[model samples]
Target: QIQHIAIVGCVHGKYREMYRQLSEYEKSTGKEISFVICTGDMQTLRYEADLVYLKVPPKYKQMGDFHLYYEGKEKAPYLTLFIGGNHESSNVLLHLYNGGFVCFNMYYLGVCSCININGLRIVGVSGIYKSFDEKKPYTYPPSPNDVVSLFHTRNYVIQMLSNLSQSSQIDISLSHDWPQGIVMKGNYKQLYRFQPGFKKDGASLGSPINKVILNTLKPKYWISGHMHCEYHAEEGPTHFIALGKIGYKNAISYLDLPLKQKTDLEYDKDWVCNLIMTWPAFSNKAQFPDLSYSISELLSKRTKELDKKIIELWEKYIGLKIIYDSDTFDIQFTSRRFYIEKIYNELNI
Candidate 1:
């Protein structure tokens, strides 16, 4: 059996409840978790994801921003990752470790990128902004209409816009060198020394986020969250993994994906599958009658095809060994078993 990696996305304010449910879920399932991944929307408005600093009442404005869970534990030195989200406070991310908001392990880097974990290569396309610029104090909320644009880089957008403005089939800004780089990003001219502004799909409303980036190693697996849905889009040698938020007031599924018996993507529909962890419903959103079961129940045959492609995910990202035969990568899963005596002794005590 392969190790299980749990990915949580878009807390937006339910940090406390998300942690509680996850910890309790693992305990009850006897599922020792490997590592956790948050795909974005980790934090939104303080009083709520609605108001900003000056807009928010003084009492809560100063207390806004994200805080990783690892800091609350003694082993705070372990690797815990937090991706940048659209609603995240740039100041908090900028001063993360320095301000003592989160441990040094919480890294906020490029928007669409990949990382090698354990031995696996995990591709993460966060809804959060990228690691560009160093806008100090705070000069965000790009447009008056947009609530949070943490991952939206004005220069990045500008670059894309500049590209489109050139000659192809249209002529908006027919200047080939129409788009130029930024001059400064943050306060003292740091990471990105360019002022922020809207770029990219300029003719349109501009992109909500950047194009997905990737990370490929001994094997390949892509993880993304933003559209607020669970989907897998396969193209050639790559797979697109997109998951939505769990704490939303919407009718999306509150799911816990399982990795049971090994199966193939060719027969994913027939592969081992199970949902409904049977835990006591414990969140405010769960109280609404689950009118979304039909959506989740539709995972009939497609699961096998999707799982086959991503089977290498855990092995690469959370494994005890790697398998290599010549130039080919054979994914290997290390079996983890606990005997009756092991549990009996603890239970007896």
Candidate 2:
């Protein structure tokens, strides 16, 4: 089975430009790309306020390509799929934050979610860089709300992803910003020469959470945009690929990966529900049971009870020749260190 997938950098609402480039690539390579994935900065503007959010020149805020697709004047040439970024239509993406169809064939990945395409498990996290932005509410007024407006990836989101990584086998992970350290893996000297100011914003560059995800998930391939610089390098078992601005040359990437036998998106519904409860944004509104008791408490309680029974059995088997202290046999808190760590991580402590 031939699986042709095209990956492009920030589309920035340039539907026709991407469509034309993908078409040309198909014609040139003699491979029909069934679907295309845009990292972010999609800016699928649908209304006048959407134009206000766009980060383009003041005069050219409205993009004809996105407008055409919205009006159905021109259908999407390919099955366009995109994640959210810093410069997207915040109001629109907010409504579809759980993930849904944008137009006909176009799809949005929402804030942090996964989708299975042709048996290829693809996961995405929307929004750009962040810092303690989880507690921040989703505001629409859009000034100081710029950071939280686009539904930036939260701490709980990263914790949930870390939990997901423990069980699921993810094929591809995409984000708007490249993972941290990816820049250092390649040539820093060349990068510094090309963009001198790049180091100035190093404090808030890319994402530390994304860097953690890359390490935790260790997916075969991790793709991203945001930085608007193309970088390809192999780190251990994972292949790191970054894309530049869509308008730049070599902004698009094409990769053919062998689909696994089992690519089903198996997620824990209860766990997801529970995780959602801990998040302040969703927790305050929803009615959920209090989950203050960590798993460590449970183990500590069970250990004492089990030790009493074990002592009884020992005495029954061979008289009380040498009595051992039941309290001494109690499994210490340190005994459950692994489980404690797992619980704390899952619960986002």
Candidate 3:
């Protein structure tokens, strides 16, 4: 079956308008959008208080429409999945570090995580890359000095995603920033015409780490947004699409994805394994540990133990109903901690 998916770029807190535009598109085209994949900068402020943590100037800050959905006053017209960007309410979303429902039908893909939706294996890495903070630890309600760094892409995420077996099949990959050198593959002349400065900084326009992951995953489709411009390129088997900010002419794009079987959000076996293997390096630590070891080598060494652990998770909790109780933050935190502890105990690591 073919599933129509809408991809939006840099929502920038324009939830109502974004949905309205999608609705208008559907009304005119008569294509039912299965779900939405927002590249980043959704700016999901659950409450007015969260405004303090948003990385925007006070004059430009406004609550936007997310609060309506958060408060049950408005429901998302479709299942929306987004990632964190520089302008997010980190105080509110940092709780779901492993990714979970931000509201009834909307999900926040964690700092780095993969989830299967209707048989589409979608993987996303939130936030842009900053070399200085690439090796730092995860901090919440981050120190004054680290507030913006809280959303910067980290090496642990890159390492975790890099661990996937080369044969792993990923349908799509999402990132807030384009991979460095992507312009060379696309219409660099047009891009340079729009943003004159890009010509000078073309070599460093986007994240180099993202480029490494792009080559590693090699998903059929790679979507990004932070550059706030729409561009298309092809590298090997991957088709790259970068969208602009909300209100721009090319802020939205769509694709009809074919799926052999349809299933709701489920854990990907490879992603779960990698998540478990990398837990020690990223879990509740003030400093990130060295992750220079090869994950493939480690997995080969502990194949039996890791397989047993995965089976345990599937039997006990993988298909179980996810609880989204009153406190969204605490629930996800508790759930992730529980899983981490179970894997640690089973693997004796």
Candidate 4:
């Protein structure tokens, strides 16, 4: 085992909760939990606002259509890889695309982007909320009688999609089954489509916006969000950890690479620990009926659960079939512009 490892993913308050736990809310992981990553969410600072913000657009469109992104003036995290989740403030990536860089703190991509952590190449992307009727100007109002904002968001998304294309220094990969215009960087391959727990026009799904952030870099693991459910999947060297909400759900996930996997060599090896701390909602333990269940403890359990779930998902979906041709297998998700692959082993892939 190289000890090379990666963390799980979460949105909104769940993000903030994870961040606070790793940082001890004020202290550090006494045991040295490294390589912490937050998938995305902008208003984790607020409670219900995090949810409301996701549903109603933003009050302040600072970076673009909304202020979906931000960081603190205070120093934090040796390395925090973040993304702008669809349910977030919206400008997190905007500020970053516009030259907002935060040392080891990091700046991530929305919809899709990539980076090399220590030598382990890692990619992150926030899936689009609605694939169809993406053009909002023509979208129906929340209520039958509600006034329309003239598709400010729809226009914003269109302009953004175009802006991204115009500003791209990298090649793009377009969708095959989608409406024929959802182009992602070669780094982004597919949407992590899920059975939306809500009503829909056709299937139970309202729209397709999920994707497999395949471990293309062969990262020891992968982190992601979008689905509010908590789950994890692993095959060989790849792992996918999903977390739930903070105040409403209070779910989190973690992983311990057993140190026998990889370590902090600074160089020589691609395996290096990054930011393993709290995020998104900052720390919402409000939903806990029992005070004994502190946010930190709750997150700690969620992390353990994720590690377990990854194994379970593998058993349920791939199992002995996980390995093909060899004991270890690296898989890839390809698109018009990008092809992402991850190394998997007999135990994981």
TM agreement with the true structure for every prediction: 0.41, 0.72, 0.92, 0.42
RMSD per model, one decimal: 21.3, 14.8, 2.4, 20.3
Model 3 has a clash total of: 0
Candidate 3, superposed: residue stretches over 4 Å from native: 140-145, 165-167, 283-305, 318-326
Residue-level lDDT tens digits of model 1 in 165-204: 1112110000001011111111213311231232332323
Clash counts per candidate, in order, are 23, 1, 0, 49
**lDDT to native, each model:** 0.32, 0.62, 0.78, 0.32
Q: Using TM-score, give the best candidate's number.
A: 3
Instruction: For residues 1-349, write the lDDT of model 3, one tens digit per residue.
Output: 7888999999988888888899998999998898899999977788877787787777868888788888999989888888888888876667777787888878887887887788777889888888998877666534545557778888767667875535467888999998888888988898889888789876678888789899988999999998888899998999999999888769999999886776666666777777666555555544444455554554544475676676577557645233344566756666776776577567765
Model 1 whole-model lDDT (C-alpha atoms): 0.32
lDDT, candidate 4, equals 0.32
Order of models, best lDDT first: 3, 2, 1, 4
Better of 2 and 3 by lDDT: 3
Kindly report which residue stretches of model 1 are placed more than 4 angstroms away from their true locations once superposed: 44-79, 96-101, 104-114, 123-150, 153-219, 248-349
